[PDB]
Scaffold this active site. Sequence first.
Site, PDB file in Angstrom:
ATOM      1  CG  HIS A 195     -34.332  45.056 -23.278  1.00 10.99           C
ATOM      2  ND1 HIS A 195     -34.337  43.739 -22.882  1.00 10.99           N
ATOM      3  CD2 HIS A 195     -35.627  45.445 -23.316  1.00 10.99           C
ATOM      4  CE1 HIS A 195     -35.583  43.349 -22.680  1.00 10.99           C
ATOM      5  NE2 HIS A 195     -36.383  44.371 -22.921  1.00 10.99           N
ATOM      6  CD  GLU A 249     -30.227  54.160 -19.419  1.00 14.18           C
ATOM      7  OE1 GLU A 249     -30.415  53.120 -18.738  1.00 14.18           O
ATOM      8  OE2 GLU A 249     -29.751  54.140 -20.575  1.00 14.18           O
ATOM      9  CD  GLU A 297     -29.368  51.320 -16.280  1.00 12.18           C
ATOM     10  OE1 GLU A 297     -28.675  50.739 -15.429  1.00 12.18           O
ATOM     11  OE2 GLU A 297     -29.395  50.956 -17.475  1.00 12.18           O
ATOM     12  CE  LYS A 346     -30.031  53.615 -24.196  1.00 14.23           C
ATOM     13  NZ  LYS A 346     -28.962  54.124 -23.298  1.00 14.23           N
ATOM     14  NE  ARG A 355     -21.997  53.071 -19.031  1.00 15.28           N
ATOM     15  CZ  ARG A 355     -22.876  53.142 -20.020  1.00 15.28           C
ATOM     16  NH1 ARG A 355     -22.646  53.921 -21.062  1.00 15.28           N
ATOM     17  NH2 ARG A 355     -23.980  52.405 -19.969  1.00 15.28           N
ATOM     18  CG  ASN A 393     -26.367  54.483 -18.212  1.00 12.81           C
ATOM     19  OD1 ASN A 393     -26.600  53.431 -17.613  1.00 12.81           O
ATOM     20  ND2 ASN A 393     -26.999  54.828 -19.326  1.00 12.81           N
TER      21      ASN A 393
END
Length: 447
Positions: A236, A276, A288, A238, A292, A290
Site C-alpha cells: 500500500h 484520495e 481519504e 506508492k 498536507r 491528505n
Amino acid sequence: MLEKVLIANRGEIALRILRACKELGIKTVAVHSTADRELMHLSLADESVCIGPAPATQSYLQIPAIIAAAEVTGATAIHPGYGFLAENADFAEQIERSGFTFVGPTAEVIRLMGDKVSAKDAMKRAGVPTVPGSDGPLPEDEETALAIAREVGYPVIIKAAGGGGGRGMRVVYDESELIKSAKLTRTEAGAAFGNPMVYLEKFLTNPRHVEVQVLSDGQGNAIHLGDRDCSLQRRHQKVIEEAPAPGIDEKARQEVFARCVQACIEIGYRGAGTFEFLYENGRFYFIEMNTRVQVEHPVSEMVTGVDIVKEMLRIASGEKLSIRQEDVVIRGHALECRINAEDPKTFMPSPGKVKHFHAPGGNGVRVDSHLYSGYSVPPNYDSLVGKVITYGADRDEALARMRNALDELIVDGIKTNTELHKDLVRDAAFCKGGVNIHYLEKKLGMD
Ligand SMILES: Nc1ncnc2c1ncn2[C@@H]1O[C@H](COP(=O)(O)CP(=O)(O)O)[C@@H](O)[C@H]1O
Ligand SMILES: [Mg+2]
C-alpha cells in the site's frame, strides 16, 4: 509575505521547501538531527538548529524542540512537509498557541480528516462519493458486525480509523474470520495509532488509486490541479505516480473535481490537500484526504505549471489564491519514479556513503533529491533519496524520457530500486496504462 520559515522536516522535502522559500524571498530555518548534519539543504539555509539525537522520536517528532527552534531563530511560520508532524493536530494547535503560522490547514481540519471515519462522513455530506461500507465504525458486537459485513458484501477490508502509511488494514474473504480479524486489527490499531477503532469497506478488486490535488486559501477560494494515478504500490506504499490519470471517464472526473473543490470551501480548507479516491468501472469512491503536501506533488506541477509549495506559502502568508480554474490547463503527461535506498529485490533499506551521484538531465527531466557525492545516507529514517520526474507531450513521451533518465542515474555506493523502475517503464501492462492497485505485487509476484 512570510518573514522566516522553519522547515520541520529533512531529506528531499526539506530541500524542496527551501527552494520555494528562496524564490519567494523568505528567510529559512533548518532543523536537523545529529545524524542529518550532512543534509544538502543545511548549507543552503539561512539558519540551522540541531534539535535532538538520531532517532526520529527524539528529534523530528519532538514538538517542544521544534517550537524552541522557532522561538530562538525568530521564525514567524513553520512548514511541516509531509510525514512527521504534518498531520499531527497537537503540533498545529501548539505552534498557533505560541503565535507562529502553520503552513497547512487548521488543527480541527487535520483532526476531521485525520480520523478516517469522520472524514468519510464529511465527504458524504459534501455529496462526494464514498467506498461502500460501515456507516461509521464496525462495532465489536458480533451480531451487528456480521450483519453490516453481509450487507456490504464479501470480500471486505477492515481499516484503522487512525491509520496511515498503508498499515492497520486486513482483508476478509469469508464471514467465518470477520470477528477474529476485526479483533486483531483493533489491537494492532491500538498500539500503532493509539486509536483501536476500525471501520469496514468493500474490498475493491480492480481499482486504481486516483487522487485530486487541491489548493484552498481559507478565504473562500479553492482550485484543483487535476488528478494523479498512484496505483503501482507495494504494501500500500506508492512507488510510481503519474499525472493526469490516463483513460478516465471525463464526466466522472469532471464531476469529482467540482465536488472536491466545493468541499474545500464547505469545510474551510486552507493550504494544499489531496482527496484520495479508488476508481473502478468509471466511478470514483473516496477513501481519504491528505491534509498536507504530498511526496508526488511534482507530476501535478508539471502538467499545470502551478507551484504547489509556493502557493502553500502564499496562502499561509495570508494571500488570496491568485490562480483561477479558467487558467488551470492540464497539458502533457508527467511521471515520477521514487528512488529509494533499499535493496531492489529484498526491499531492505540500504544506508551508506554515496561515493558518486550523477543526476539525469535533458528535455522534460526533473530531479528532486538531496543527494550529492560524498553524502552518507543514515539508517534512521525513510528510504527515499530522490524523485526522478519526467514530462512529455503525452504519456508515451514521459515514459520514453524516464527510460533515458533512469539510464543516466548513478547512485554509486549503495543499493537502490532503480532497476525495478527500469523494468516497470518497459512493462507491457504498465506501458499500456491503467493498471490496478494489485498489479505490482501480482507482477512481482511471478518469481
Ligand atoms: N476498500 C479498499 N479496497 C481495496 N484496497 C484498498 C481499499 N482501501 C484502501 N486500499 C488500499 O490501501 C491503499 C491506501 O489506502 P488508504 O485508505 O489511503 C490507507 P492510508 O491512510 O494508510 O494511506 C490504497 O491505495 C489501496 O491500495
Ligand atoms: Mg493514503
